[PDB]
Design an enzyme around this catalytic site. Structure first.
Site, PDB file in Angstrom:
ATOM      1  N   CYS A 169      -3.825   1.090  11.250  1.00 23.31           N
ATOM      2  CA  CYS A 169      -2.624   0.930  11.087  1.00 23.31           C
ATOM      3  C   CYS A 169      -1.831   0.902  12.508  1.00 23.31           C
ATOM      4  CB  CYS A 169      -2.570   1.695   9.903  1.00 23.31           C
ATOM      5  SG  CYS A 169      -0.594   0.979   8.682  1.00 23.31           S
ATOM      6  N   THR A 183       0.926  -0.692  -0.264  1.00 23.55           N
ATOM      7  CA  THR A 183       0.117   0.041   0.024  1.00 23.55           C
ATOM      8  C   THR A 183       0.910   1.339   0.026  1.00 23.55           C
ATOM      9  OG1 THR A 183      -0.411  -0.036   2.450  1.00 23.55           O
ATOM     10  CG2 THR A 183      -1.625  -1.211   1.264  1.00 23.55           C
ATOM     11  N   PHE A 189      -6.088   4.157   6.843  1.00 25.37           N
ATOM     12  CA  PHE A 189      -5.069   3.903   7.590  1.00 25.37           C
ATOM     13  C   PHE A 189      -6.577   3.580   8.840  1.00 25.37           C
ATOM     14  CE2 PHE A 189      -2.376   7.258   6.591  1.00 25.37           C
ATOM     15  CZ  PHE A 189      -1.119   6.074   5.841  1.00 25.37           C
TER      16      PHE A 189
HETATM   17  C1  HEM Z   1       0.364   3.520   3.217  1.00 18.19           C
HETATM   18  C2  HEM Z   1       0.165   2.971   3.712  1.00 18.19           C
HETATM   19  C3  HEM Z   1      -0.894   1.972   4.597  1.00 18.19           C
HETATM   20  C4  HEM Z   1      -2.210   1.543   4.427  1.00 18.19           C
HETATM   21  C5  HEM Z   1      -2.891   2.841   3.475  1.00 18.19           C
HETATM   22  C6  HEM Z   1      -2.170   1.120   5.393  1.00 18.19           C
HETATM   23  C7  HEM Z   1      -3.644   0.495   5.556  1.00 18.19           C
HETATM   24  C8  HEM Z   1      -4.201  -0.579   6.650  1.00 18.19           C
HETATM   25  C9  HEM Z   1      -5.643  -0.226   6.766  1.00 18.19           C
HETATM   26  C10 HEM Z   1      -6.726   0.517   5.988  1.00 18.19           C
HETATM   27  C11 HEM Z   1      -5.951  -0.951   7.879  1.00 18.19           C
HETATM   28  C12 HEM Z   1      -6.844  -1.775   9.555  1.00 18.19           C
HETATM   29  C13 HEM Z   1      -7.576  -2.702   8.281  1.00 18.19           C
HETATM   30  C14 HEM Z   1      -8.867  -3.617   9.039  1.00 18.19           C
HETATM   31  O1  HEM Z   1      -9.223  -2.937   9.618  1.00 18.19           O
HETATM   32  O2  HEM Z   1      -9.093  -4.787   8.257  1.00 18.19           O
HETATM   33  C15 HEM Z   1      -4.226  -1.957   8.573  1.00 18.19           C
HETATM   34  C16 HEM Z   1      -3.854  -2.636   9.075  1.00 18.19           C
HETATM   35  C17 HEM Z   1      -2.627  -3.087   9.242  1.00 18.19           C
HETATM   36  N1  HEM Z   1      -1.346  -2.355   8.756  1.00 18.19           N
HETATM   37 FE1  HEM Z   1      -1.320  -0.824   7.406  1.00 18.19          FE
HETATM   38  N2  HEM Z   1      -1.236   0.342   6.120  1.00 18.19           N
HETATM   39  C18 HEM Z   1      -0.126   1.281   5.533  1.00 18.19           C
HETATM   40  C19 HEM Z   1       1.512   0.643   5.550  1.00 18.19           C
HETATM   41  C20 HEM Z   1       1.732  -0.057   6.838  1.00 18.19           C
HETATM   42  C21 HEM Z   1       2.464  -0.176   7.110  1.00 18.19           C
HETATM   43  C22 HEM Z   1       4.002   0.275   6.852  1.00 18.19           C
HETATM   44  C23 HEM Z   1       3.003  -1.381   7.745  1.00 18.19           C
HETATM   45  C24 HEM Z   1       3.836  -1.604   8.230  1.00 18.19           C
HETATM   46  C25 HEM Z   1       4.991  -1.606   8.618  1.00 18.19           C
HETATM   47  C26 HEM Z   1       1.219  -1.453   7.867  1.00 18.19           C
HETATM   48  C27 HEM Z   1       1.014  -2.736   8.724  1.00 18.19           C
HETATM   49  C28 HEM Z   1      -0.371  -2.992   9.420  1.00 18.19           C
HETATM   50  C29 HEM Z   1      -0.885  -4.032  10.155  1.00 18.19           C
HETATM   51  C30 HEM Z   1       0.166  -4.781  10.575  1.00 18.19           C
HETATM   52  C31 HEM Z   1      -1.706  -3.564  10.699  1.00 18.19           C
HETATM   53  C32 HEM Z   1      -3.128  -4.392  11.294  1.00 18.19           C
HETATM   54  C33 HEM Z   1      -3.153  -3.659  12.506  1.00 18.19           C
HETATM   55  C34 HEM Z   1      -3.412  -4.714  13.131  1.00 18.19           C
HETATM   56  O3  HEM Z   1      -4.953  -4.515  13.532  1.00 18.19           O
HETATM   57  O4  HEM Z   1      -2.815  -4.646  14.286  1.00 18.19           O
HETATM   58  N3  HEM Z   1       0.550  -1.242   7.158  1.00 18.19           N
HETATM   59  N4  HEM Z   1      -3.354  -0.354   7.621  1.00 18.19           N
END
Ligand code: HEM
Ligand code: HEM
Ligand SMILES: CCCCCCCCCCCCCCCC(=O)NCC(=O)O
Lengths: 445, 453
Positions: B398, B266, B391
């Site tokens: 996130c 993403t 996010f």
């Molecule tokens: C533009 C960059 C990013 C976007 C738009 C993004 C978007 C999101 C979104 C929308 C969710 C929630 C998903 C849900 O509710 O089902 C999420 C969760 C998560 N993201 Fe990001 N993400 C990004 C970058 C990153 C990066 C760089 C990392 C790790 C270094 C990361 C790791 C995670 C993890 C592990 C979750 C799950 C969190 C949890 O439920 O404990 N993401 N992300």
């Protein structure tokens, strides 16, 4: 007067079936081992005489009696390298013309001019190896070809092949290798227009280089002299067709053999760890700046000896050809008629025990502590006389810089206990040589 | 109480035939354009409700009433991401366990520590572009993927993918893309056990195997080394303060897969979209480049200087507004309740936040929602709550948001400092979907400003 030795002939095919190998130079070395310092070799339509002793090659290198010949190999290479410097006759107008025009591009002034760009590519090599993970290894000739091709491209033509941005060989290399391999196989004979296709890839690249130069900035490299320099003798510049041939010529001759040399030198170093230790000691002591200066690279004397001894054992351009200018007697024993061809079998020359002593197979850089206390014409990895390698200083400065930086920045491990396998494509190179490198964790510039 | 809108149904197949596309999110956006702020969507066996207005999504984000749901998409991704942080239920032991163990890797201490490594990879990108010849161009999403994958590999696992040393995508990427694509396509199969498709599933299993071989390599390279303090260090050694337990080996492997994917895909999409909008809006490009040149005054950027790139950050946020590269997330109803005072919901009912459509709510953003104007984010505390959700939400938001935004601000800043860009093909926007969103075929030429690193 003596009758000249010759291995068995098979009627129409003559001596041709005695090669039948992907390793013709090493096979000719075996034949020389059995028949001695000179033997005749006939193929359908052609004949030559292979020389292996210093006493005869000393005579063959007399330019009043013998001149550079285009061996059949080089005649095949001339199909795409034309009357460029490597594949032209001494008496062709474009030979002396191009020699005069391009020699200043290998003056020490010019070398000092190339140094920053060589460092550019060398730094790319070092960073690549710094960035390997622990479970990974280095493919040595592959990375040496990345380095040398990029170096001649940038220094010579301000063109970036960007070989380190590719995990496969550059297209130019794949086609070049196939074309050289094809000339080589053709010496022992659809392959045909695969050949024409590879030539077309190489020429398309030349097109890109010329177009990139004309579309640009003030420059003063090899290409600048090709395009603008005038022969002091005649007053004339090179014409377009010969310029294209020189570009092909320098792109190939300007990297392949240097890649081989760096590969063999690293091979011998990891196989002789006390010698490796001396070389690394020198690199660490001399290369004190974050990137090497020109003047410091000139101080790498042991590294230069290492490179010369690698060239002694496996000269990566392993032969050159001569023809007889007038009827004469060679060595006081072998009569030759005008036009008769000779082949200098360089690895075999370099194993002449009457010159080097009985331990010719050992890797001893110290043989070159006093490089011209060595007898005349004993050591010929760069050919002879007015047709000797125009790029020798370029090659050795590049290889000394690069091997110096390698020894400064890493410890090397022969982790597979690699068994030397020499691949032939007219030129020689270790095949499958791999090592591991442990960074000494010393920062760059 | 109101009856909830629902588009046309087709006999047992329900709403499924309205998709039949490799661009389902864009299709759901067209459907939302027709049906409004909320609509029911049924496939065989499942139902969810797509929300597009801030007034309703504000309620959906109330965690006293709704919790994160594993959508069918996420259940399919769970086949290879298991109970890693992204694809676990909030009340699964390994979610809270892994959250507690791994959150410290995203403290400011840790970010300040990652900065040099991010710069390492950024410098590789800039050098690649500096070294292109005059007749060449840049494949944008490809190089953004090289950058972001390498950055999470290095910062997270001290592992170098060395993507800039390859002229094709890294094997991990090819397999990841095919696996995400399979997860996406499987959502639209009426009969998924149809022979052509189980013939198909072989590839899915092969791709999962490639991703796991790479995990094996990361673990072995760490074990073969003798000191770290990254995400992997916490995975291997950290213990949950609540339960006292470390993560087990299997969950650790799932976390590695999870962070390698979520930690780059993403962000690559975001940098790609941001660059697209910049070349399509040269005035905004000029402004952003001016900020970059004024701010990034050292030979390589400092941590503190990246934080000063405020306009660049606004650019990224407006890119996320128009095309949030994680374009949806899912919720379930904790207890019988009424949404928006109009729509009754039973315990268990699912909601889907259709983020791009939310991000085009004219009552929030004004009538010109399709135009690219970063200045929309100058005073973010006048933007209504839950108007902007790239996010996700709440305790399941996130974990990598700061990581991602620091990386992208750094990299886009260096790009703007070091090159002028040309849209030499006048590229027509083509958005490829693999659950996530990314421009496909986006190419530019870059002319170096000849500024040393
Ligand atoms: C533009 C960059 C990013 C976007 C738009 C993004 C978007 C999101 C979104 C929308 C969710 C929630 C998903 C849900 O509710 O089902 C999420 C969760 C998560 N993201 Fe990001 N993400 C990004 C970058 C990153 C990066 C760089 C990392 C790790 C270094 C990361 C790791 C995670 C993890 C592990 C979750 C799950 C969190 C949890 O439920 O404990 N993401 N992300
Ligand atoms: C270790 C590296 C090298 C080795 C062993 C080597 C070897 C040789 C040999 C044996 C010849 C004479 C061939 C014959 O008599 O048929 C030659 C000529 C030539 N080489 Fe080199 N070479 C090396 C590097 C280079 C480089 C780096 C360049 C270009 C920058 C170069 C350019 C040429 C050219 C143009 C000729 C023809 C010279 C003339 O006849 O005017 N070589 N080389
Ligand atoms: C390990 C993390 C992998 C990253 C996956 C990120 C997914 C991005 C958001 C999911 C998008 C779902 C919307 C796709 C179309 C759709 O109708 N989904 C509903 C459903 O699958 O049940």
């Amino acid at each position: 007067i003596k009758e000249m030795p010759q291995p068995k002939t098979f009627g129409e095919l003559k001596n041709l079936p005695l090669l039948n190998t992907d390793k013709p130079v090493q096979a000719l070395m075996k034949i020389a081992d059995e028949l001695g310092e000179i033997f005749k070799f006939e193929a359908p339509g052609r004949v030559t005489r292979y020389l292996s002793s210093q006493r005869l090659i000393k005579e063959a290198c007399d330019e009043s009696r013998f001149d550079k010949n285009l061996s059949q190999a080089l005649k095949f290479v001339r199909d795409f390298a034309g009357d460029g410097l490597f594949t032209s006759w001494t008496h062709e107008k474009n030979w002396k013309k191009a020699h005069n025009i391009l020699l200043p591009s290998f003056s020490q002034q010019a070398m000092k001019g190339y140094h920053a760009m060589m460092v550019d590519i060398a730094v790319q090599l070092v960073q690549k190896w710094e960035r390997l993970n622990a479970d990974e290894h280095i493919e040595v000739p592959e990375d040496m070809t990345r380095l040398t091709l990029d170096t001649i491209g940038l220094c010579g033509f301000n063109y970036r092949f960007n070989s380190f941005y590719r995990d496969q060989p550059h297209p130019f290399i794949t086609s070049m290798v196939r074309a050289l391999d094809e000339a080589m196989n053709k010496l022992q004979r659809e392959n045909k227009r695969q050949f024409q296709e590879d030539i077309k890839v190489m020429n398309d690249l030349v097109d890109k280089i010329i177009a990139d130069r004309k579309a640009s900035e003030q420059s003063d490299d090899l290409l600048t002299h090709m395009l603008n320099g005038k022969d002091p003798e005649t007053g004339e510049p090179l014409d377009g067709e010969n310029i294209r041939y020189q570009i092909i010529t320098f792109l190939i001759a300007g990297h392949e053999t240097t890649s081989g040399l760096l590969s063999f030198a690293l091979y011998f170093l990891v196989k002789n760890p006390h010698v490796l230790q001396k070389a690394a000691e020198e690199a660490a002591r001399v290369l004190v700046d974050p990137v090497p200066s020109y003047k410091h690279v000139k101080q790498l004397k042991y590294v230069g000896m290492v490179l010369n001894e690698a060239l002694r054992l496996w000269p990566t351009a392993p032969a050159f050809s001569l023809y007889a200018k007038e009827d004469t007697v060679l060595g006081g024993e072998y009569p030759l008629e005008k036009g008769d061809e000779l082949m200098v079998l360089i690895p075999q020359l370099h194993r002449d025990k009457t010159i080097w002593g009985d331990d010719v197979e050992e890797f001893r850089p110290e043989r070159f502590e006093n490089p011209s206390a060595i007898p005349q014409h004993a050591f010929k990895p760069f050919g002879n006389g007015q047709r000797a390698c125009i790029g020798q200083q370029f090659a050795l400065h590049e290889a000394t810089l690069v091997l110096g930086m390698m020894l400064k920045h890493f410890d090397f491990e022969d982790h597979t206990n690699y068994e030397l396998d020499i691949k032939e494509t007219l030129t020689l190179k270790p095949e499958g040589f791999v090592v591991k490198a442990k960074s000494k964790k010393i920062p760059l510039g």
